[PDB]
């Protein structure tokens, strides 16, 4: 998963729990987001990953305080999602990375970039 | 400090804390990092921030279970640090942000980026 975050589960229950754990033992590690595409936490503690695919320009909202129900809401302003996974990734600001932006991007699609004409 | 995290202290004792993950267990609580550069938690609870600068390509390891001693260990693989603060920040994956990578990066330095030439 990632170096400064906590791997939990395998296959479709894979979890990239952040919140580390202060390098302790059987702590209550939390804040997990399933890495498997179109799989999402089923419980608030993310004990199990469930399957609820969306479409482009949508994220997966998850109301419930013990077991989640799922609503495939549209992408917020300033974000995008070009897959069925249903995660609002932030826009790639080309300007802070080195380039200008050729097409600005929208809910469906992320920005592309036109550099500096050398 | 940050909207979803907890400001504590002022000046050089400036730190930010995460929710104590009150879920259960006894692993730890209020994991805090200090904001002022080259200042690091002195105790596990991060009651006070102490001063222990490193160099580029190094992080600050902190062994001790009540009061920390400090070892300026090198940066882990996959990370960098270009300052004396001694924090291993993760590499900027240009590909997931919008761009390609012109120079890949190393322990000393993070990656710069190259685009799509169309």
């Amino acid at each position, epitope marked *: 998963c990632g170096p400064g975050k906590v791997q939990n589960g395998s296959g479709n229950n894979t979890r990239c729990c952040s919140l580390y754990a202060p390098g302790k033992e059987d702590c209550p590690k939390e804040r997990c987001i399933c890495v498997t595409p179109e799989y999402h936490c*089923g*419980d608030p503690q993310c*004990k*199990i990953c*469930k*399957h*609820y695919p969306c479409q482009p320009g949508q994220r997966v909202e998850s*109301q*419930g*305080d*013990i*077991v*989640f*129900g*799922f*609503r*495939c809401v549209a992408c917020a302003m300033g974000t995008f999602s070009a897959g069925r996974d249903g995660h609002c990734r932030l826009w790639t600001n080309c300007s802070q990375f080195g380039f200008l932006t050729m097409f600005p991007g929208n809910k469906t699609h992320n920005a592309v970039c036109i550099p500096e004409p050398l | 400090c940050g909207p979803g995290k907890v400001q504590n202290g002022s000046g050089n004792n400036t730190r930010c804390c995460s929710l104590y993950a009150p*879920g*259960k267990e006894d692993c730890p609580k209020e994991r805090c990092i200090c904001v002022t550069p080259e200042y690091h938690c002195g105790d596990p609870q991060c009651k006070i921030c102490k001063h222990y600068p490193c160099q580029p390509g190094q992080r600050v390891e902190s062994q001790g279970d009540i009061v920390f001693g400090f070892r300026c260990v090198a940066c882990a693989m996959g990370t960098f640090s270009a300052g004396r603060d001694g924090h291993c920040r993760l590499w900027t994956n240009c590909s997931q942000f919008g761009f390609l990578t012109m120079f890949p990066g190393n322990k000393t330095h993070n990656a710069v980026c190259i685009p799509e030439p169309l």
Partner: antibody
């Protein structure tokens, strides 16, 4: 895990009762806890939800405004303050824990609302 | 919100496979979650499945759940039906914060003796 309901019985129409569910058995305050009822010979009807802290409560409909759920770590007890009871509230009332999905359940206590 | 409809009953021979279909009915978000609870005599319900599958311990592997169709259609499958599997079967649902928790109307499983 053991859950024991109590405080049910025969009560007049328009009256009130308080059910209790004693627990320990697991991590009471460290889990959610539910009330569910069933008329004898009929189906299960979900009745109540108390936040593990006890700060917030969640209910269905036919009893919203009339019933109440709360917790007291003292003896791991639930608090079904049922008010303004009607003949349709006659049922076996069970406690259990929404944790992941109704983990364990009690034997139930019978409430009879009768003229 | 208010939905979840279950067949009235079925009679099945020992060693047969019985499928109990909990139709979401106006399910909308049918994949949100499902659980199966089992009730015998005047005893309390026993949780057979939470989380669509992952049967809790003790319950026999012969009980399995699946959420297929995605056209509103969770199902509880009992393979190799045994004599101690006579019972009313209930499918608890989600809507944990959509509105309120809900339960199906129950399905009676009788055994061919």
């Amino acid at each position: 895990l053991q859950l024991v309901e109590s405080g049910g019985g025969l009560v007049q129409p328009g009256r009130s009762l308080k059910l209790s569910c004693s627990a320990s058995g697991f991590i009471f305050s460290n889990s959610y806890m539910a009330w569910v009822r069933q008329a004898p010979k009929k189906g299960l009807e979900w009745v109540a939800t108390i936040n593990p802290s006890g700060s917030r409560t969640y209910y269905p409909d036919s009893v919203k405004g009339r019933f109440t759920i709360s917790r007291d770590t003292a003896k791991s007890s639930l608090y079904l303050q049922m008010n303004s009871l009607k003949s349709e509230d006659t049922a076996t009332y069970y406690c259990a824990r929404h944790d992941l999905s109704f983990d364990y359940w009690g034997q139930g206590v019978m409430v009879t609302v009768s003229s | 919100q208010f939905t979840l409809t279950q067949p009235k009953s079925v009679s099945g021979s020992l060693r047969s496979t019985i499928t109990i279909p909990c139709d979401r009915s106006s399910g909308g978000i049918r994949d949100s979650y499902v659980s199966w609870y089992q009730q015998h005599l005047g005893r309390p319900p026993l949780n057979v499945i939470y989380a669509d599958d992952q049967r809790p311990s003790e319950v026999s592997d012969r009980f399995s759940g699946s959420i297929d169709s995605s056209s509103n259609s969770a199902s509880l499958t009992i393979t190799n039906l045994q004599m101690d599997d006579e019972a009313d079967y209930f499918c608890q649902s989600y809507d944990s914060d959509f509105d309120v928790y809900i339960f199906g109307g129950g399905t009676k499983l009788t055994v061919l003796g």
